[PDB]
Design a protein around this ligand. Structure first.
Ligand code: HEC
Ligand SMILES: [C-]#N
Length: 112
């Protein structure tokens, strides 16, 4: 792609002013939120709790696994991460994810 996962995470860490924390990323990803859309209370609603397995849309269509260990080119395009997170941070949390949240989430996801 046009970037590496490390370059993406570094960019978010610089915007947040702090290093990524993958344990915080894991906790946010598995969390149940109440501020966003009713049908999507968690990132796991579509991607599952184990990101090495396929996820499912809200209609049951298969979503390729988010883990780079199962799907190779994950997190190698800066616009694609922004485009999807720009949509589903709002759907799950009710607001855009901050750059620190994006750093933490990708740091956890990139190691799976
Ligand atoms: C269903 C409505 C979703 C919810 C809720 C969340 N995500 Fe998602 N995500 C969804 C799709 C259909 C896709 C694209 C399909 C694909 O195979 O990529 C994505 C994509 C992402 C990405 C980008 C991956 C890349 O290749 O760079 C990321 C980083 C991601 N999803 C993470 C993520 C998080 C952190 C969520 C909660 C805030 C979340 N997703 C919610 C579908 C859905
Ligand atoms: C997904 N975003």
């Amino acid at each position: 792609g046009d970037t590496s996962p490390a370059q993406l995470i570094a960019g978010y860490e610089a915007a947040a002013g702090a290093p990524a924390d993958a344990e915080r990323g894991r906790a946010l990803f598995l969390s149940t939120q109440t501020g966003g859309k009713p049908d999507t209370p968690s990132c796991t609603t579509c991607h599952g709790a184990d990101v090495t397995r396929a996820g499912q849309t809200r209609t049951g269509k298969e979503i390729a696994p988010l883990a780079p260990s199962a799907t190779p080119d994950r997190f190698t395009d800066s616009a694609r991460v922004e485009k999807w997170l720009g949509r589903n941070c709002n759907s799950v949390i009710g607001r855009d994810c901050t750059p620190g949240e994006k750093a933490d989430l990708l740091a956890w996801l990139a190691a799976q």
